[PDB]
Amino acid sequence: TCPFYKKIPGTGFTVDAFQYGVVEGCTAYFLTHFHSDHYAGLSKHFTFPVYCSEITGNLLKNKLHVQEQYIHPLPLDTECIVNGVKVVLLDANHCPGAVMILFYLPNGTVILHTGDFRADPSMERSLLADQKVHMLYLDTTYCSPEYTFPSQQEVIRFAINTAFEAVTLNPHALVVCGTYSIGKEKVFLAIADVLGSKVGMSQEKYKTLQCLNIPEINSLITTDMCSSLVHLLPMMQINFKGLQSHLKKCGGKYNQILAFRPTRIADVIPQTKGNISIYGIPYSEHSSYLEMKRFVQWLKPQKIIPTVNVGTWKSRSTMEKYFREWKLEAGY
Ligand SMILES: CC1(C)[C@H]2CC=C(CN3CCC[C@@H]3CO)[C@@H]1C2
Ligand code: NI
16 A cells, blocks of 8 residues: 555655555655656556656656646746645656655645755755745665765766776777666766767657756767767676677777776776776766765754665664754754
């Protein structure tokens, strides 16, 4: 059955709740972003209203074939009325089109649902700051202090420098980048830009990227693999066997592969077999522990409801202990 943490009390709304059939009482289904665990169950035969960002709506139409009449895109940073309730969509700093949702309940309660997010201090300057928020439905993916990661900018600097050095030393090296969902496009776009190349990919991945409203996208990507020295492959193919196989297909154009898997940064080393090297780089689209803690201590919610790691009693207890520490430290 549909879990409590996907229902919005005092409304006919659910969030990311498409795998449970017709949810009794639901007059509007919100979708925070186009990742498969969240859209699970949506298909071309869905016949209820779906509320989402413009980008998410482009993907629903073109990739899942949801009929146009059921797709309700909303602009960001704008007060909108849906089935008699004021809502705002905010940028989640996750993947393209990903949003947080602010609900202004008829009874005066205000609820924030983060969807999946990477907390940032810039979130402290939006409509979020204009009123008190009582309940927070929180992306707790990395809610433990061992989760430190570098800034996205630091990780991209490492990738650009690594690729440029390798290809300047050997002009016959190919760069390959793994993907299995939308998100983390900066990794392959930044590398291709330093190398003066478009990014080559399958027709299916090209279609997906053409839905994302990226400026000047036609100048950056292509389906002509032969013209490109940065290729995208499915994440499952980023291993010595898959990459050896890909090199054979390039017809003797290349004699080395440098590959990236976007799972201290200065000290990161690759796995190497012969003329193939694979780098795992810590590019995150979710909050680190410290980023999450800063956001929650600024927001000062009355109640937090985790939406990730909820399946075990140990995980639930661990998260509850951190929420109480944070509250006692900051005095709310
Ligand atoms: C974020 C979490 C609340 C859930 C997922 C991962 C966690 C961190 N791990 C690494 C070692 C200690 C602990 C158990 O796997 C916490 C349990
Ligand atoms: Ni996600």
